[PDB]
Amino acid sequence: KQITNPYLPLYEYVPDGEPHVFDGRLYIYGSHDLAGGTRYCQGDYVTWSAPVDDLKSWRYEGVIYRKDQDPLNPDGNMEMWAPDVTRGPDGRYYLYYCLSFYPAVGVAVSDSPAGPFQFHGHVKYPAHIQGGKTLAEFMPFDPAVLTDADGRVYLYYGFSPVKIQFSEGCMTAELEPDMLTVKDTPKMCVPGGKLAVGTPFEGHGYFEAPSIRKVGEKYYLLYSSQLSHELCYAVSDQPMEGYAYGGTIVSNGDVGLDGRAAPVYTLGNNHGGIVQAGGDWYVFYHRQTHGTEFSRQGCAEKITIKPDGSIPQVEITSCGLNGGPLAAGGSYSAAIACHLTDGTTLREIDYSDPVMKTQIQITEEARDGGEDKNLHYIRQIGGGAVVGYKYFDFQGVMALDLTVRGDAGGRLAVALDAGMKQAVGGADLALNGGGWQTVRIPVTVPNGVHALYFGYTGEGRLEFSDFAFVTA
């Protein structure tokens, strides 16, 4: 069996995923994008899970909570954004979420990690602070919750941009066992970008998307930084104070990795956390598709937590949860690319830029039958474009069968590096119609593990749906 990135099937769009192991299964609790979506998080919340010892087998557990279950949202006019789920000290499962830019944290509850969740309440002040009202201060946003090893419960939230009233950083408070009532007014624990100036956090301040995990006895607080495309971490010995800046864990364009400035893949917001599954640690994040920020898909990479507690930045890959490189036999969707750029790939996220519409991008097209019949492919491939995959175990590979279409007149080169300097083969591209076709490209690749890159040079545009390995 094999698994790639994204780990859920290509017709599923679960960004903002919080990974938790419950009763032997790794559940992912994210928001819910739609293919071709026109706004953030348009679907009801679902969950998917794999056995914790076999992360290559994900199954769909259904919708677990709907937009209209919150009393603030009777017509479902507002979306539900990035959630978190904790097993509370009472043994039940508590789901925390905010409606789209609504300044309250809602809470639902179930006895099962797969639902059904029923509305529980809104996070609120105790009777003696602010008349016990619903918490609406310091911009409630992107909630994350920890049920600690001793049974205490801590909430983390906030929205702190640098670009009404917003957060100065990540805010935090301990909740009572009702899972609604804070023990005290929330306080800041990680500085936002503004307050980050002068600190070790400088340039990587808190922006959104906290995720709290226990690593041994330590508290690891991940967040999406002011850069938005990266996930950073801070570490403390205490849950609500004393956080020291860690570093970057993952960027969805590998920005920052080895000082890289030009992204390897279209940048966008990023959300997620770490999890211990098997004997290893993973980071879950999401990627962008469709040339927008509204069709996002969960990905993951193994990480290493060093003996001193630090977590070096990891590169994005196509094999993610596979536990090793993929087989260089059989057929693959082009949509599992972890490298995807052209001459318009932006260094600064800007989804208003009209160049996004005509940029190289992964898209989906509904087809007769099930979602598994839907076509995924890369469109808008022109000269200067590069498409890349990590990693394959090449054994006796003689050729590649590329399924393409379009009106392109030029050269498709094949290489093992993104700079296209380790060239292993190439094809003349003579297609000026509009029906799919397979092109065999002979390649001289020595056996062993390699990345795989396709580079296009010339005029026209092409679309790329699948590639297959031709072995001896």
Residues labelled as active-site residues: 16, 208
In one letter, which amino acid is 212? I
**Which is closer to Ca ion, CB of 82 or CB of 114?**
82
Separation CA 360–CA 333 (nearest Å): 16
Residue span binding Ca ion (CB under 5 A) among the ranges 8-16, 128-136, 198-206, 324-332: 8-16
Q: Are 374 and 457 in contact (CB under 8 A)?
A: no
Q: How far is the CB of 36 from Ca ion (least distance, A)?
A: 12
Q: How far is the CB of 105 from Ca ion (least distance, A)?
A: 12
Q: Are 265 and 316 in contact (CB under 8 A)?
A: yes
Q: Are 323 and 69 in contact (CB under 8 A)?
A: no
**Which is closer to Ca ion, CB of 93 or CB of 391?**
93
**Burial class of 275 by CB neighbour count within 10 A (0 to 12, 13 to 18, 19+):** buried
Q: What token pair was written down for 381?
A: 């491939």
**Which is closer to Ca ion, CB of 82 or CB of 378?**
82
**Which is closer to Ca ion, CB of 82 or CB of 277?**
82
Residue span binding Ca ion (CB under 5 A) among the ranges 5-13, 87-95, 101-109, 130-138: 5-13
Separation CA 268–CA 273 (nearest Å): 17
Q: How far is the CB of 142 from Ca ion (least distance, A)?
A: 5
To 10 degrees, the CA torsion angle through 373, 2, 454, 315?
120
Q: What token pair was written down for 22?
A: 């419950």
Which residues of the chain come before a gap where C and the next N are over 2.5 Å apart? 163
Q: How far is the CB of 206 from Ca ion (least distance, A)?
A: 13
Separation CA 255–CA 289 (nearest Å): 18
The reply to whether 82 sits near Ca ion by the rule CB under 5 A is yes
Which residue, 329, 471, 463, 337, is CA-closest to 408?
A: 463
Separation CA 368–CA 22 (nearest Å): 36
The reply to whether 8 sits near Ca ion by the rule CB under 5 A is no
- Residues touching Ca ion, count (CB under 5 A): 2
In one letter, which amino acid is 347? R
Residue nearest to Ca ion (CB): 82
Q: How far is the CB of 376 from Ca ion (least distance, A)?
A: 14
**Strand partners of residue 365:** 375
**Strand partners of residue 393:** 327, 449
The reply to whether 105 sits near Ca ion by the rule CB under 5 A is no
**Which is closer to Ca ion, CB of 274 or CB of 416?**
274
The CA-atom distances, in angstroms, between 20 and each of 29, 166, 243, 354 are 8, 29, 23, 38
Residue with tokens 């279209």: 266
**Which is closer to Ca ion, CB of 270 or CB of 359?**
270
Q: Which of residues 11-40 bind Ca ion (CB under 5 A)?
A: 12
**Which is closer to Ca ion, CB of 28 or CB of 381?**
28
**Sign of the CA dihedral 367, 370, 373, 375?**
positive
Q: How far is the CB of 156 from Ca ion (least distance, A)?
A: 9
**Burial class of 42 by CB neighbour count within 10 A (0 to 12, 13 to 18, 19+):** middle
Q: How far is the CB of 401 from Ca ion (least distance, A)?
A: 30
Residue span binding Ca ion (CB under 5 A) among the ranges 6-14, 68-76, 376-384, 394-402: 6-14
- What residues line the site for Ca ion (CB under 5 A)? 12, 82
